[PDB]
Amino acid sequence: KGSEQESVKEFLAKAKEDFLKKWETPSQNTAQLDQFDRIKTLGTGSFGRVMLVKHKESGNHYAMKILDKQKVVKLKQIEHTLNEKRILQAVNFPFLVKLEFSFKDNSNLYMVMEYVAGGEMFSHLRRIGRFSEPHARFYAAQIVLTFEYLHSLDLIYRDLKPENLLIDQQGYIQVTDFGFAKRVKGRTWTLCGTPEYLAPEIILSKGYNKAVDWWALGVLIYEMAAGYPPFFADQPIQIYEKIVSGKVRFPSHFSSDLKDLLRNLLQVDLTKRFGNLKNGVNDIKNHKWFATTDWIAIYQRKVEAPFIPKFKGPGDTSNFDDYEEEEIRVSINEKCGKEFTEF
Amino acid sequence: VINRFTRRASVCAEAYNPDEEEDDAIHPKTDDQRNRLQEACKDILLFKNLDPEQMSQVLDAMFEKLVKEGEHVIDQGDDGDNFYVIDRGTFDIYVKCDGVGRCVGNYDNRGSFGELALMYNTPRAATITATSPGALWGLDRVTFRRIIVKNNAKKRKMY
Ligand SMILES: Nc1ncnc2c1ncn2[C@@H]1O[C@H](COP(=O)(O)OP(=O)(O)NP(=O)(O)O)[C@@H](O)[C@H]1O
């Protein structure tokens, strides 16, 4: 079995031709603010927040990420911002969250994503303590296939962590937050991500590639299976010291194959890290730990999730913590409009 | 085992990719004071991994910051993009926060802060008012990143 169960060469050929196409030709102002009821703030970011919303005329719920152009501009992370929109609206994958439309006004940038009432894997992982290798592996096979997808288009997600992983109505992952998603020809530099997930090549300004997403994979699988992240401490600097040192310990319950597959994923020498060798992602699909995985089924979502969140009906905002609702008003004066003309 | 949990935010530095020109062609060594940095840095992360080449070019990148007294080098809340180092003088530490705003430390002709702004921008963790007159050493994040990045792009990799 392994990487020979599913034949994916022709698929990634069309997928690439379909992505180059949508990327070069987006869509602008496909909606309006005054068309959505700001139900509740699902999550707060750095430049804004994602609020649950309901279209007045459709009565439909969506997740709305809001971004303060000025702040974006203020912080100079204006490029990723545009990339997040354009790249997201350009991809299609079973485990990739979908965008419905977008638009802008005098103060903000609006991205309207489908709503995933399931919540962040983080909410459940933290509540359930830690998952069984089976359960953890189930989510992993999904990232491995999305990373394969995304990377073949020459894209780097750059931000894997439980927090950005939505569990939908069937128990499947919906990757959200394309804030660091960038297209890469050979390598990139921007130091970015989430502390406990940053690879050693990013922390030290060493130029990196699609191999930092694979490193994040080894961390994710770890935190899912162990309960806590492999590298943790009070000071993030205390975290970066450890990531760099690279030394890690494994829960005594961690099976022997999980320990083998993480030693190759959390490999400091990127010319030795799994997913970045000659056979690429296949080494991962043929690792002993992924011995019981049915890739074709996994892809078609034809496998019963080991866990499905409690789901009531339309608008259920319980799987999500609560957040300080802080009203948002547009403006009579446009700010930094020429610096977002693409949106 | 372990602990310390709670939803984690995303860190992000400014966008950057060299490939441009590389013009250019160094502050006053102060020599005696020089040893102070090369010693107060042998503990810093982004410094410990550096090459002597990168180290050298890095010491000079740091400018000289002056402050009399009742002065505030770093206000708790500020974005800040500079890494500082006490050279002379005395400074107190007001962790002004939690609800109130007490005091919590004393820096004196030793001790450095802001190591976390050399990587990306982030909220200053505490106000550091000067009990000086004293002289500090600062280093811009940008000034720093360019030094390291420009140097690492030259390195040949295995594709
Ligand atoms: N499609 C979605 N459906 C439901 N909830 C969502 C969706 N997209 C985002 N969220 C939630 O909103 C939170 C914040 O969105 P996010 O895009 O991650 O903010 P951010 O600006 O990227 N901040 P950060 O994640 O730290 O970089 C997420 O962690 C989810 O809980």
Ligand SMILES: [Mn+2]
């Ligand atoms: Mn983000």
